[PDB]
């Protein structure tokens, strides 16, 4: 990581935080920690959360989501490359009006998928369906859409261009260069 500080620590001084690759407990908590630090540095200035992720752990992603909502600074989100599954959930969770994608980003949403005794399978199946239901409800809220839309649109993999994600309510604006924003 090229020092100049290492490059990512240098960009954190500009209040940029990256989520790259799969969402795990460790990658999620490092994002969380940066969020908490930037709030400590300045609780009123925007934070810029750059997401390039295929998704990953649901609980790890929820640690990021809840921290984004907790802290005082607005967390603006930007998809580069892709935001799929939990990546898309988090992209759509950015401060409304400050959710962005670059022109050739790809977004994808879908229902939960997973890798004992019948009693235990019942317990975990019921929990998995509650998780599916909660994510559809939260996403509907982010997207300003009907819950029935999210139930329909996550039954199988739903790949979206940047424009399709904006029309869906998942992001607010597509930025090709600086000139954009409106």
Nearer to a copy of itself, 162 or 169 (CB): 162
Q: Is 85 a catalytic residue?
A: yes
The residue among 162, 136, 158 whose CA lies nearest residue 149 is 136
Q: Give the whole-angstrom CA distance, residue 7 versus residue 15.
A: 13
Q: Is 155 in the site for a copy of itself (CB under 8 A)?
A: yes
Q: Which of 96, 97, 127, 163 is the binder for a copy of itself (CB under 8 A)?
A: 127
**Minimal distance in Å, beta carbon 169 to a copy of itself?**
20
Q: At what angle do helices 58-70 and 25-41 cross, to 10 degrees?
A: 10
Angle at CA 32, nearest 5°, toward 2 and 178?
A: 60
Q: Which of 49, 55, 75, 82 is the binder for a copy of itself (CB under 8 A)?
A: 82
**Residue from 27, 53, 76, 85 carrying the catalytic annotation:** 85
Q: How many CA atoms lie within 13 A of 61 on its CB side?
A: 25
Dihedral of CA atoms 164, 84, 95, 32 in degrees, nearest 10, equals -170
| Binding map of a copy of itself across residues 35-74, x = CB under 8 A, - = no contact | -xx--x---------x-xx---x-xxxxx-xxx-xxxx--
Count of residues that bind a copy of itself according to CB under 8 A? 87
Nearer to a copy of itself, 146 or 164 (CB): 164
């Amino acid at each position: 990581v090229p020092t100049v500080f290492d490059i990512y620590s240098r960009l954190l001084k500009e209040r940029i935080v990256f989520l790259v690759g799969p969402v795990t407990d460790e990658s999620a908590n490092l994002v969380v920690a940066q969020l908490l630090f930037l709030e400590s540095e300045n609780p009123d200035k925007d934070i810029f959360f750059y997401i390039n992720s295929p998704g990953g752990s649901v609980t790890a992603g929820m640690s990021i989501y809840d921290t984004m909502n907790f802290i005082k600074p607005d967390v603006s989100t930007l998809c580069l490359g892709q935001a799929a599954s939990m990546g898309a959930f988090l992209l759509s969770a950015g401060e409304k009006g400050k959710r962005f994608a670059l022109p050739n980003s790809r977004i994808m949403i879908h229902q939960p998928l997973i890798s004992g005794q019948a009693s235990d399978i019942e317990i975990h199946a019921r929990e998995l369906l509650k998780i599916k239901e909660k994510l559809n409800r939260l996403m509907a809220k982010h997207c300003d859409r009907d819950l029935a839309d999210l139930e329909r649109d996550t039954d199988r993999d739903n790949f979206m261009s940047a424009e399709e994600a904006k029309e869906y309510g998942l992001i607010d604006q597509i930025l090709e260069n600086r000139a954009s924003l409106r």
